[PDB]
């Protein structure tokens, strides 16, 4: 076994004890520890665990400041070499070259692995958590200085590499093999953005373009917008702008569906509108856009729309089935949604709401520290639980959709603003009054209303076409 430097010159050589580290009941899993012990294990000489690095770098700011983290890993990097053993001493006193067997084993099995892994923490830190440096230019200078003064031929390839990566990052493309399907058009023809609307665009192309849009919004959310539950606090617009942008799109699209429905007062036309939205839902399912699916389900279950019994009576049974099965995904705390998400072949667009609730509750129902023997240990298993969630989010963010963007249709949906200049409550009340108007409460009889659409209402359907 290797002898370690003295704990008096090198703090990371303290023996493991229940006072500084606790393991969970082929690598160990850490339940809690001091910062020193967490950083030793983050850069352990005995095994590889890159997932520990992602976990740590995602969550460390709740127990350690960035400046302090850098100090600690620089200190971990600076390992004292042992003095010559007795056999070496005797060779040197006879004018011979010592074998230096212990020094060489220590360099090869302790110093080089620990220093490489310190460098790997720096690399991951800069590549995937660069916002620490964007928000603190002095932290970046210390990093650049540290990396740029590492000497020794052993570390050289990675030192040069990390220097280039830092530079690239400071001044901050898809292969498919098969082609995207052809863009589908209906009543609105290419270029005629003025005529674009729920019934005039092709429902296949509506679902596709909304899926591209919602996928891009999903893929833009960073872990920094989630950890510490910052999307719920006062500065959420500062700290979680991508998340909120994503949520607001979902909300706007749901309100647009509701608005399209209750503002169609003629019963026959409203049936065509509801039926077109259920067809869009069906393409959402085909594309694994679960965010899209729940936009539709949320709209059908809203107060203005849910109560329209006369409208739903006229919907084809096959479409009632499609809608009801989509709604069942959300029942029992999303039981069937979760099972379906974990069984499909990506790309997909998850529903983000479940993640937010799990992160918030994990952070709220677990203590920051555990107290053992008078010592305060960082509760690391709480951090690992949060990073399991952000990790799953990132996993579904990797796979891109093989679909062609249509710039005008994308623009039309980006600028959708169903509420206009109205406040939420006022607009919400308006929708419900519209609902009461077009289908009054029992026992008041059902009125008739004039048609408003001058083009045909027949759907082109949701099966794609393919010319040569």
């Amino acid at each position: 076994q290797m002898r370690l430097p003295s704990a008096d010159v090198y703090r990371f050589a303290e023996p493991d004890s229940e006072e500084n580290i606790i393991f969970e009941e082929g690598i160990p899993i850490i339940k809690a520890g001091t910062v020193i012990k967490l950083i030793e294990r983050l850069t352990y000489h005995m095994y590889a665990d890159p997932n520990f690095v992602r976990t740590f770098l995602t969550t460390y700011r709740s127990f350690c400041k960035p400046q302090e983290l850098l100090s600690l890993i620089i200190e971990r990097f600076e390992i004292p070499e042992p003095e010559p053993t007795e056999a070496d001493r005797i060779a040197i006193e006879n004018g011979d070259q010592p074998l230096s067997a212990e020094l060489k084993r220590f360099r090869k099995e302790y110093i080089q692995p620990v220093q490489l892994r310190v460098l790997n923490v720096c690399r991951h830190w800069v590549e995937h958590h660069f916002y620490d440096f964007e928000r603190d230019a002095y932290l970046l200078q210390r990093m650049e200085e540290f990396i740029g003064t590492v000497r020794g031929k052993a570390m050289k390839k990675w030192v040069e590499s990390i220097t280039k990566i830092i530079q690239r990052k400071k001044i901050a493309n898809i292969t498919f093999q098969s082609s995207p399907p052809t863009v589908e058009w209906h009543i609105s023809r290419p270029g005629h953005i003025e005529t674009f609307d729920l019934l005039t665009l092709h429902p296949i192309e509506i679902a596709r373009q909304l899926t591209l849009l919602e996928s891009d919004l999903y893929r833009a959310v960073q872990p920094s917008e989630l950890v510490g539950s910052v999307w719920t606090k006062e500065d959420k617009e500062i700290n979680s702008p991508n998340l909120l942008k994503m949520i607001r799109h979902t909300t706007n699209l749901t309100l647009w569906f509701e608005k399209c429905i209750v503002e169609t007062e003629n019963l026959e036309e409203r049936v065509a509108v509801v039926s077109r939205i259920i067809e869009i839902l069906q393409v959402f399912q085909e594309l694994n856009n679960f965010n899209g699916v729940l936009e539709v389900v949320s709209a059908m279950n809203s107060s203005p729309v849910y109560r329209l019994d006369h409208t739903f009576e006229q919907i084809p049974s096959r479409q009632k089935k499609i809608l009801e099965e989509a709604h069942e995904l959300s029942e029992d705390h999303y039981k069937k949604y979760l099972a379906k998400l974990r069984s499909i072949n990506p790309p997909c667009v998850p529903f983000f709401g479940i993640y937010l609730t799990n992160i918030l509750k994990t952070e709220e129902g677990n203590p920051e520290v555990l107290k053992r023997h008078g010592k305060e240990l960082i509760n690391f298993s709480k951090r690992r639980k949060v990073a399991e969630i952000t990790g799953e989010i990132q996993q579904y963010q990797n796979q891109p959709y093989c679909l062609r963007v249509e710039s005008d249709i994308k623009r039309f949906f980006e600028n959708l603003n169903p509420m206009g200049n109205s406040m939420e409550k006022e607009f919400t009340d308006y929708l419900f009054n519209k609902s009461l108007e077009i289908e009054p409460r029992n026992p008041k009889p059902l009125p008739r209303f004039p048609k408003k659409y001058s083009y045909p209402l027949k759907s082109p359907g949701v099966r794609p076409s393919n010319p040569r």
């Binding site: 999307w231 719920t232 979902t250 937010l356 609730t357 799990n358």
Partner: protein
């Protein structure tokens, strides 16, 4: 076999609302929660000698998904309307939450309780007398809870189950 009650928690975000359900479902002898597992929102309890199952829907964190509110509320037989006693805005939101529940349930008489929650050691800004007065005008019970000490948590949920039983 036993009665299952579907309870829904509603209220402004960002002010400790989720501590309620967590303090209830928890072991309540060790802070060690995993919301990821089914069994983390169901709980068997004895209320006035009658055993029952509580199913709690707490979508804390999702407040910004405001067009999903109707669908979530629709699922519930009773409602906890929660505000923070150190956040006047959350108290002023209560009225619109109650209106939205009545609309979604299509009823003027829906089992609900008003819950004032103390989430930290910051200064109170809603006096309990204001909350009592608001609860009385709605004809519902008012319970104050602490998000740290488990004080009042059982009382809030058990009181809600009594409102359902007596409805």
């Amino acid at each position: 076999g036993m009665t299952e009650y579907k309870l829904v928690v509603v209220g402004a975000g960002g002010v400790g609302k989720s501590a309620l359900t967590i303090q209830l479902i928890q072991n309540h002898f060790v802070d060690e929660y995993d919301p990821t597992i089914e069994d983390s929102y169901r709980k068997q309890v004895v209320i006035d000698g009658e055993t029952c199952l509580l199913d709690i829907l707490d979508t804390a964190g999702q407040e910004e998904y405001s067009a999903m509110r109707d669908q979530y509320m629709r699922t519930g037989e009773g409602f906890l309307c929660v505000f923070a006693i150190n956040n006047t805005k959350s108290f002023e939101d209560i009225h619109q939450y109650r209106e939205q529940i009545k609309r979604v349930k299509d009823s003027d008489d829906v089992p609900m309780v008003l819950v004032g929650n103390k989430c930290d050691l910051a200064a109170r800004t809603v006096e309990s007398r204001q909350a009592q007065d608001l609860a009385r005008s709605y004809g519902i019970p008012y319970i104050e809870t602490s998000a740290k000490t488990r004080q009042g948590v059982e009382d809030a949920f058990y009181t809600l189950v009594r409102e359902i039983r007596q409805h």
